[PDB]
Amino acid sequence: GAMNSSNYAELFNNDIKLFVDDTNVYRVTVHKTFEGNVATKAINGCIFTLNPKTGHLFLKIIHTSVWAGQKRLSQLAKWKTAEEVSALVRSLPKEEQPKQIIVTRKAMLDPLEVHMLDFPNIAIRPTELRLPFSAAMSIDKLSDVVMKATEPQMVLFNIYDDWLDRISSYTAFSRLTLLLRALKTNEESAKMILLSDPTITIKSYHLWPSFTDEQWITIESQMRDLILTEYGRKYNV
Amino acid sequence: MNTVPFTSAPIEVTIGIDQYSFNVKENQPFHGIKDIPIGHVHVIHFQHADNSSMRYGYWFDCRMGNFYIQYDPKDGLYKMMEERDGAKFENIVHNFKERQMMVSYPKIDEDDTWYNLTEFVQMDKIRKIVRKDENQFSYVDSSMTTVQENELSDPAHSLNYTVINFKSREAIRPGHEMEDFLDKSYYLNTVMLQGIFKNSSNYFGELQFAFLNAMFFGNYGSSLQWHAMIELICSSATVPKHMLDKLDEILYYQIKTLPEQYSDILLNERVWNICLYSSFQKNSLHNTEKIMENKYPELL
Ligand SMILES: COCCNC(=O)c1cncc(Br)c1
Ligand SMILES: COCCNC(=O)c1cncc(Br)c1
Ligand SMILES: COCCNC(=O)c1cncc(Br)c1
């Protein structure tokens, strides 16, 4: 059924699975019209599809052209997500297809289930975790490729960079979720933390800086402080 | 006017005939039911005084044979039987008629309730759902499961209802996933109406049979089937106007007839609120919405 704290290690066993997050698929700026009404302008979006074990990120870029002439875009966005996830599974060799797909918002279950009727053997599951994947558009390199796209496009990343060479997938997911939670709660502070020391760089082929084991500890410690802090600044505690 | 004569009433039993019911005491001199209107199907049903578990009963059409009830003390129930010797039966019936040992089907002449609940119900169609072909009548009870229920365990004793599943490849055309799930007109009009029922009278017929089994025997899967068939129409943007008008009348009389104290289990809040207030046809069931709102406003 649903995925929660009690079955959290299942994410790092050897059954292929993907998280799907749709929170950046349909994105708008809201503005005033000359007549003093309000209108939206869509901007490019993305589907965040992640293998938590490997770090493989299938970033489907959703180009604004896909909304042209369409009505009820928040509901179409969910079906558009489901179509693209289904297409991706179909594109994969059978032995590479996931056994489970975990959606991060429950409104994605029915659209994905209907699109995956051909794959009765793939379980479509919700989660009770409040995962911070919406903050993936705070990662500069991901925001850039999305905003620059002129057509629909799939781009492949490893969101753990090279971390699995030194840590387990459990620890790499924990780091990712802490980084993302920090970016969501205070993007500016989070970013100031990550890029303070100019001697630490981000390799062309990576998303995050090349931190030593000890520098990651310091970084991880500062991201917690931020999250505990912003929780005080928010709740006055 | 036809007659379902009984050999005897050896066990205390509540007897249903269509929407009427009466109590018979252990070994009371009761020998059946007379004046049954020709031209409709009927259902005679049973709830023993000792064990309210297992409502059971028989769907029949008096034009298809002479039917009598005999209590079987081995199997412990009132069994429907056919008498092929038509003089032996007419003689047996006349004797009981003369001795006034039969209750009279108590149809009020103004009352079209039964006709309105059974307009599209046919005995030959019931017989291709309840499979037991050596008999012209059809047994049903509370615990019989539907073909679909067994998929999710004895097949001979199942209700072979028409399998409806909104998240199935039958319901969803490749490439129309969003379209067909949010607007079920394809599934209603092409898959179900044109290729299985053949017309809407047949769709209305299983819908009517489903409700009656759900209400008379408390059959859970019949309740599921009834709601599924309602929801498929209400969730279709494109429905012939004659079918919408007829559905409204159909449902009105089912809602009117439902016992007020059984509304609790026999009415699915989600299906009804969806059908009346959110669905494509939310404005198309005026009579049904008015009776539902005045009689069961709690449910909504
Ligand atoms: C060979 O005759 C034995 C079976 N028939 C009956 O017992 C009978 C027939 N018709 C009505 C009623 Br009540 C009883
Ligand atoms: C085609 O499947 C067998 C039942 N078909 C019907 O069309 C039908 C019609 N009226 C009542 C009932 Br109960 C079913
Ligand atoms: C507490 O009831 C759990 C099953 N629910 C039902 O609503 C139901 C059950 N059996 C028959 C019929 Br008809 C309805």
Q: List the CATH number of the domain containing B136.
A: 1.25.40.550
Strand A45-50, strand B13-17: pairing: unpaired
Q: Do B181 and A117 touch (CB under 8 A)?
A: no
CA-based nearest residue to A63, from A84, A82, A44? A44
In angstroms, rounded to a whole number, what is the distance separating the alpha carbons of residues A75 and B198?
A: 34
In angstroms, rounded to a whole number, what is the distance separating the alpha carbons of residues A141 and A54?
A: 19
* Amino acid identity for residue A205 in this structure: Y
Q: Contact at 8 Å (CB) between B185 and B239?
A: yes
In this structure, is the dihedral angle defined by the CA atoms of residues B215, B216, B218 and B221, taken in order, positive or negative? negative
CA-based nearest residue to B219, from B271, B122, B146, B148? B146
- Token pair in block for residue A37: 């009404």
Q: Which of B168, B169, B177 sits opposite A79 (nearest CB)?
A: B177
A74 touches chain B (CB under 8 A): no
In angstroms, rounded to a whole number, what is the distance separating the alpha carbons of residues A210 and A216?
A: 9
A115 touches chain B (CB under 8 A): yes
Min distance A79 CA to chain B CA atoms (Å): 6
CA-based nearest residue to A83, from A64, A66, A106, A105? A66
Q: Point out the ligand nearest to the CA of residue B227.
A: 3
Q: DSSP letter string over B236-286?
A: -S---HHHHHHHHHHHHHHHHHS-GGGHHHHS-HHHHHIIIIISTTTTS-H
CA-based nearest residue to B248, from B278, B296, B286? B286
Phi, psi (deg, nearest 5) at residue A68: -65, 125
Angle, CA B59 vertex, CA B56 and CA B62 arms, to 5°: 135
- What single-letter DSSP state applies at residue B192? I
What is the residue range of B227's domain?
116-299
Q: Contact at 8 Å (CB) between B24 and B13?
A: yes
Question: B-chain residues within 8 Å CB-CB of A120?
Answer: none
A108 touches chain B (CB under 8 A): no
Q: Contact at 8 Å (CB) between A202 and A210?
A: yes
In angstroms, rounded to a whole number, what is the distance separating the alpha carbons of residues B78 and B101?
A: 18
Torsion of CA B283, B286, B292, B295, to 10 degrees: 140
SS (H, E, C) A87-132: HHHHHCCHHHCCCEEEECCHHHHHHHHHHCCCCCCCEEECECCCCC
Count CB-CB contacts under 10 A for residue A143: 15
User: Closest ligand 3 atom, CA of B214?
Assistant: 13
- Token pair in block for residue A138: 């705070």
In angstroms, rounded to a whole number, what is the distance separating the alpha carbons of residues A84 and A20?
A: 11
Domain boundaries, chain A: 9-163, 164-237
In this structure, is the dihedral angle defined by the CA atoms of residues A106, A108, A111 and A115, taken in order, positive or negative? negative
Q: Do B167 and A111 touch (CB under 8 A)?
A: no
- What single-letter DSSP state applies at residue B6? B
Q: Point out the ligand nearest to the CA of residue B102.
A: 1
- What single-letter DSSP state applies at residue A8? G
In this structure, is the dihedral angle defined by the CA atoms of residues A35, A38, A39 and A45, taken in order, positive or negative? positive
In angstroms, rounded to a whole number, what is the distance separating the alpha carbons of residues B257 and A67?
A: 49
Q: Do A111 and B178 touch (CB under 8 A)?
A: yes
B172 touches chain A (CB under 8 A): yes
Phi, psi (deg, nearest 5) at residue A166: -125, -25
Q: Contact at 8 Å (CB) between B82 and B66?
A: yes
Count CB-CB contacts under 10 A for residue B107: 17
Q: What per-residue string of b and e applies to B69-96 under the rule 16 or more CB within 10 Å gives b?
A: bebeeeeebbebeebeeeeebeebbeeb
Q: How far is the CA of B60 from the centre of ligand 2 (A)?
A: 15
Q: Which of A76, A82, A113 sits opposite B167 (nearest CB)?
A: A113
Would you tell me which CATH number, out of the four given (3.30.420.230, 3.40.50.10470, 1.10.10.10, 3.50.50.60), belongs to the domain A9-163? 3.30.420.230
3 state DSSP class of A162:
coil
Torsion of CA A83, A85, A89, A92, to 10 degrees: 110
Report which secondary-structure segment, H or E, holds B81.
strand B77-82
CA-based nearest residue to B168, from B104, B108, B228? B228
3 state DSSP class of B189:
helix
Question: B-chain residues within 8 Å CB-CB of A110?
Answer: 167, 181
Looking at domain A164-237, what is its CATH homologous superfamily?
Answer: Prp8 RNase H domain, fingers region (1.20.80.40)
Min distance B116 CA to chain A CA atoms (Å): 37
In this structure, is the dihedral angle defined by the CA atoms of residues A84, A88, A90 and A96, taken in order, positive or negative? negative
Min distance B156 CA to chain A CA atoms (Å): 28
Torsion of CA B29, B35, B41, B43, to 10 degrees: -20
Q: Contact at 8 Å (CB) between B130 and B43?
A: no
Q: How far is the CA of B220 from the centre of ligand 3 (A)?
A: 5
**Quick one: residue A161, left, alpha or beta (phi over 0 = left, psi -120 to 50 = alpha)?**
left
User: CB burial class (10 A; 0-12, 13-18, 19+) of residue A114?
Assistant: buried
In angstroms, rounded to a whole number, what is the distance separating the alpha carbons of residues B115 and B113?
A: 6
Q: Which residues contact B169 (CB under 8 A, 6 or more apart)?
A: A117, A118
B37 CB within 6 A, ligand 3: no
